Design a protein around this ligand. Sequence first.
Ligand SMILES: Cc1cc2c(cc1C)N(C[C@H](O)[C@H](O)[C@H](O)COP(=O)(O)OP(=O)(O)OC[C@H]1O[C@@H](n3cnc4c(N)ncnc43)[C@H](O)[C@@H]1O)c1[nH]c(=O)[nH]c(=O)c1N2C=O
Ligand SMILES: Cc1cc2c(cc1C)N(C[C@H](O)[C@H](O)[C@H](O)COP(=O)(O)OP(=O)(O)OC[C@H]1O[C@@H](n3cnc4c(N)ncnc43)[C@H](O)[C@@H]1O)c1[nH]c(=O)[nH]c(=O)c1N2C=O
Ligand SMILES: Cc1cc2c(cc1C)N(C[C@H](O)[C@H](O)[C@H](O)COP(=O)(O)OP(=O)(O)OC[C@H]1O[C@@H](n3cnc4c(N)ncnc43)[C@H](O)[C@@H]1O)c1[nH]c(=O)[nH]c(=O)c1N2C=O
Ligand SMILES: Cc1cc2c(cc1C)N(C[C@H](O)[C@H](O)[C@H](O)COP(=O)(O)OP(=O)(O)OC[C@H]1O[C@@H](n3cnc4c(N)ncnc43)[C@H](O)[C@@H]1O)c1[nH]c(=O)[nH]c(=O)c1N2
Lengths: 216, 216, 217, 210
Amino acid sequence: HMKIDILDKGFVELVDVMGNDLSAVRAARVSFDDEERDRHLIEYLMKHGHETPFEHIVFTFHVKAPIFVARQWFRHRIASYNELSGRYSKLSYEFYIPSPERLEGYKTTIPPERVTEKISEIVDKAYRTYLELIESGVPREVARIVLPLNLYTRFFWTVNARSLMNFLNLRADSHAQWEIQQYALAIARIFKEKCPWTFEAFLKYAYKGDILKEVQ
Amino acid sequence: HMKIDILDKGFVELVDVMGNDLSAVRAARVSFKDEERDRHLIEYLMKHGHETPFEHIVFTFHVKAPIFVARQWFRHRIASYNELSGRYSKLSYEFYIPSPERLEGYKTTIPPERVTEKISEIVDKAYRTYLELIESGVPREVARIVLPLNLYTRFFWTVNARSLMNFLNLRADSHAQWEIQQYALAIARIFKEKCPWTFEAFLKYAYKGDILKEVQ
Amino acid sequence: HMKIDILDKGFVELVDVMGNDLSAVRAARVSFDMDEERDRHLIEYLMKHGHETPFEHIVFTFHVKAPIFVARQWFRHRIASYNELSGRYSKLSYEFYIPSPERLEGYKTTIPPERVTEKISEIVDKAYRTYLELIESGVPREVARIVLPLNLYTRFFWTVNARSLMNFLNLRADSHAQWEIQQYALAIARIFKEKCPWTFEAFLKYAYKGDILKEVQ
Amino acid sequence: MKIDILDKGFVELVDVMGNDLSAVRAARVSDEERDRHLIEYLMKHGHETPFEHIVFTFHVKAPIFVARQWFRHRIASYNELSGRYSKLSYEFYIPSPERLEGYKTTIPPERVTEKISEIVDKAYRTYLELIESGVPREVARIVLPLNLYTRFFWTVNARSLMNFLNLRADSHAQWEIQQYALAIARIFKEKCPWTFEAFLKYAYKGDILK
Ligand SMILES: Cc1cc2c(cc1C)N(C[C@H](O)[C@H](O)[C@H](O)COP(=O)(O)OP(=O)(O)OC[C@H]1O[C@@H](n3cnc4c(N)ncnc43)[C@H](O)[C@@H]1O)c1[nH]c(=O)[nH]c(=O)c1N2C=O
Ligand SMILES: Cc1cc2c(cc1C)N(C[C@H](O)[C@H](O)[C@H](O)COP(=O)(O)OP(=O)(O)OC[C@H]1O[C@@H](n3cnc4c(N)ncnc43)[C@H](O)[C@@H]1O)c1[nH]c(=O)[nH]c(=O)c1N2C=O
Ligand SMILES: Cc1cc2c(cc1C)N(C[C@H](O)[C@H](O)[C@H](O)COP(=O)(O)OP(=O)(O)OC[C@H]1O[C@@H](n3cnc4c(N)ncnc43)[C@H](O)[C@@H]1O)c1[nH]c(=O)[nH]c(=O)c1N2C=O
Ligand SMILES: Cc1cc2c(cc1C)N(C[C@H](O)[C@H](O)[C@H](O)COP(=O)(O)OP(=O)(O)OC[C@H]1O[C@@H](n3cnc4c(N)ncnc43)[C@H](O)[C@@H]1O)c1[nH]c(=O)[nH]c(=O)c1N2
């Protein structure tokens, strides 16, 4: 299974896939079974906006992302989600602590290392308060509300190539938060590995973002 | 490939599938095996209305059906479709001619065999008019409008188990037209073969229709 | 109620609408927490930068009477709500779309365009008479109707938001789409322009991918 | 219509399209007593598509943990407060001691309320300190707790709204979202009384509304 590590404790793991570039070719021509002619069709469908044949290629991912990242991701309605229940599921209680390198470019009054320290400080205080409430008898659903937005969560993502290509135009772009951009780059990498023709054609004719045309 | 013939010239063919019953188990637990425990979870998710884990099992079918059946089918929006272009495809023109046995139960002034003959008569007249217009230079998109609603079409249907179970509840039921009931029975057969635990649980706790609890 | 007649016997009628151009402004203004000129400037900004979600808050309900072959192309738009006349039970008017000889202008035909119109009328009369003969003899509606041509008129209700409506106009109000549905999309664009003038103007200026709306008034 | 939820939250009706007859007009394509009888017929026989023609727009102010459960309902339109570009107001959900009634706790319920206020003040002060020192909003905000209030616009049709009520206006859903769901049901009852009544009588799967 393809697994790309993202941020300090996160990942993107490919669980399953249905079809390849030819799944889109079969659907566009409508018949159940030439390499150059088939790849030429992929480029034709892409450059002319014939997006429906690409809905026949489906992916299942296992993502471990911080809640603030998952909140931006889960806004993509044309997909299937299954996340860990904060009310009942036994979470690992891992948190995203940005490295000082995340603050490179911004001029700060305090050192970037002090920002990293202040984030660690408040997640430890919040987590200790949570355990103290849990130990005292407060139900999980009430005690968990004190936990920060950088807390790690795990989910299953079933998405078709069409909706995956929309996620890439929006999330694999400089206007999206750096944290989600990283997760989208891993999604693009897994997509390129499984559908090389559809990915290449996408970057050539349909891709609206910027970071995928700059980063290898 | 599983292929079930429906009506006089139609079929339902399984193109591809992603996952099995365990795909729904993995998605519900949020983790990438105990037969009794896994089957007990499928039954728990089904009886308590936890339907989202079943969206992680996806199917691709190749269906050949009359346009009046396709019109009823394509009303199911939570799916992916790709049909033959009536405007450009050099399609095989075949029509659904109901057998006299289709009219069994209804009291008719003319014999059921005469109904079958009258349908064949008018489809031949309509098809001959179409070819005459096509030969005379009329574009396909205009000449085709004279063809009857029993004209066979071909399409590719990508649907997840949840939306497939909604289709079964509605189309594999006596209230739906006899022609689509037949197509839904073939869908249920391919679904049972690939996801036996999910199909058994669905019939036991969620299935709202009638014909699937009567027909084997 | 706005009603635009399409083809020989069809129409597009506006049943209801929710919101206007300022509905999209109110929905966008919640993001960055906080005037006609300023609110029109926002619509144009959202449109040119691909911020499409605020436009989902403007919803329309239409009543369309179109030939089945047109409805088949329309109903492919899944991000909408539909409700059509039941062919199995509903009492249809039994009206058919007969193209005028002017529809065949441009194409070189061996037979005159007037003969094409006559041949279409000929076969719809034959099919309709066969249908009534089966209906009178006791054949159930669901079986007897299968002989009727694709040019037969149907009626439906269409509930669609401005975002999905703008996808429809992109695809159907374009030269690559069949002339029949282009006509229906032009009336949709007309009703959309009348209710959402700022959104429609911004749409043609920055987001519209088709061709006929930038040429036809 | 505005219904206040929890300590600082609300559900406000922005706009609505149609009423009970919008579903009647949409169904009749396929008299008060005869129209109401149709509503009950469509509901008891599972004819749900005519109800998609009644659409609502709400303005909701709810904590992030409630919004996370709400936003899982994909058959709807959402528009939320950025966070990356918006000005973070000191608005967090502090449960009252009455929220812990029923559970036996080692510390008093009033001390739980105090400990929640204590940690939100610490997290909000840390946030302002990072913001003042030059840390961008999108990075500094990650320290804020899940009880932080957010605002969003919700455009949903009656069919998807009735699915939301079957799931969220039920004892199995968290008590906080149940409260919001009761406000969604109240506004729905006021605008579509026939649809709500028939829904309660034949289609409603939950428990708290009955
Ligand atoms: C750089 C940036 C900034 C922000 C945001 C995003 C980005 C990249 N987003 C999220 C997007 O709005 C959108 O949710 C997401 O891009 C998914 O984007 P999305 O495009 O809505 O994805 P989808 O999976 O829901 O659906 C895929 C396609 O399906 C169609 N669709 C689906 N449901 C529909 C329906 N109901 N009606 C009509 N069409 C519908 C539509 O054509 C869409 O492209 C914000 N959202 C918000 O509310 N306030 C904000 O300030 C921001 N902003 C701050 O982070
Ligand atoms: C009491 C309780 C506990 C938990 C949860 C919920 C509740 C109430 N939920 C969230 C539900 O899934 C939620 O109701 C759903 O997302 C929206 O619930 P939902 O019912 O899927 O609502 P929708 O608006 O997305 O869509 C409305 C309808 O549209 C159809 N649909 C939409 N998209 C589809 C598609 N892609 N494929 C097929 N059909 C699709 C489908 O028929 C659905 O009924 C959990 N989810 C999770 O992953 N782990 C968990 O432990 C939990 N659990 C704790 O949090
Ligand atoms: C000129 C022309 C020619 C032809 C066709 C059309 C035209 C204009 N179309 C129809 C399109 O394929 C399509 O259905 C629709 O027009 C676009 O219709 P569409 O763009 O898919 O619109 P929508 O309303 O279903 O959904 C709105 C948005 O929602 C998203 N979406 C919705 N459901 C989704 C999902 N499940 N997965 C991923 N994304 C999904 C997606 O981003 C989409 O833009 C054909 N279809 C076919 O099967 N064979 C053919 O030969 C032809 N062709 C000959 O007539
Ligand atoms: C016996 C019988 C008879 C008829 C019909 C069906 C059957 C089974 N229909 C068709 C019917 O109205 C419906 O369109 C199809 O059965 C598809 O059902 P869904 O919408 O549930 O599936 P679909 O696949 O489209 O969606 C699945 C689920 O997604 C949700 N959903 C999808 N899009 C949504 C949206 N925009 N808003 C809210 N929820 C949404 C719903 O929860 C739905 O259950 C009909 N139709 C007609 O027009 N006239 C008629 O007379 C009949 N008669």
